[PDB]
Amino acid sequence: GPLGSMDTETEFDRILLFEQIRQDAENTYKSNPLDADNLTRWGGVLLELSQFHSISDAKQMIQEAITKFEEALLIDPKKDEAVWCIGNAYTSFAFLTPDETEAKHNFDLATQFFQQAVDEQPDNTHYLKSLEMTAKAPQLHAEAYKQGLGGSHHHHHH
């Protein structure tokens, strides 16, 4: 906890937090590519920083965030996190991907992974949300892209 206003922050302060992590994780990679913990945390942040970072960079950040988990999964296959992370990545990347097909394909992918995370502990509130999130994987994306500033609304009635 290197200093902090503690109130709301302009997000930046929070970005720095993730930054130091990314560097610590990324750097830790070469320091220990076996450390699935650092490999996983290296992703979690990527996803986080990806939020503040432009989608373009967010996407590329997610992609790598996935490949990162892969190696982590190699170190520890029981890493329900590395699995969920992979899912959380796809889910996020999907929202960034307009290609419903790809987005959906991803959303449905993160699902197959979530089943693993929960597998270890389905009592995990996090994994629960990750799973429940799939409930409207194709919808979240639709409403995600639909809800904003486009044009047409829809063609249906009550």
Domain ranges of the chain: 1-158
Report the alpha-carbon distance of residue 75 to residue 61 in Å, rounded: 21
Any residues with CB less than 8 A from the CB of 96 and at least 6 apart, and which? 55, 58, 59, 62
- How far, rounded to the nearest angstrom, does the alpha carbon of residue 110 sit from its chain's CA centroid? 10
Please report, as a single letter, which amino acid is at residue 149: L
C-beta separation of 86 from 69 below 8 A: yes
Nearest C-alpha neighbor of 135 from the set 80, 73, 91, 81 = 91
CATH classification code of 1-158: 1.25.40.10
